Amino acid sequence: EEQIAEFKEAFSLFDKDGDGTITTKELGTVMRSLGQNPTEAELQDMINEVDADGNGTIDFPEFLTMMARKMKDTDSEEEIREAFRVFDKDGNGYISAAELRHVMTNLGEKLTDEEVDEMIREADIDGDGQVNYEEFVQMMTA
């Protein structure tokens, strides 16, 4: 989910209008620059279907949905990303001991505090009190 952050430059380059959405003038300009001249009604229906609002303004989620649909990520990557989303209640991409206790209590698989701390240490590699992406995936690989 964090890989889509690089699309910001592409959106800015495509949206030369500078009004926060793709304008008809910008579409015509880029179309003429590229050289191809398809049907105008084709572009109208394409932008209407792409844009969620459908009022001629293209927003970020309109392109984000298409990018996500066309991504077709790997099953293991999707599983690990979903697991990280569900463990991190705050959604900041960080896992703490208290979050581990909260998810353990919610799931019902409660463990003793010593056991939770030992699991944290087993996942911990730099020994400062953090659990990271590569740490968890390396623990899962074994």
Binding site: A83, H102, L107, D113, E115, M140
Partner: protein
Amino acid sequence: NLRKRIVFRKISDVKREEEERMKRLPPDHPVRRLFQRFRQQKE
């Protein structure tokens, strides 16, 4: 003893846990099996 080390909790952490519980996984079968395997290995 430098080799031996103590385990503990923090006041702010337990306070925020109490606050969170006041404002209170069922389909998490694979990670549940993961936790079971980790507990069995630790046993």
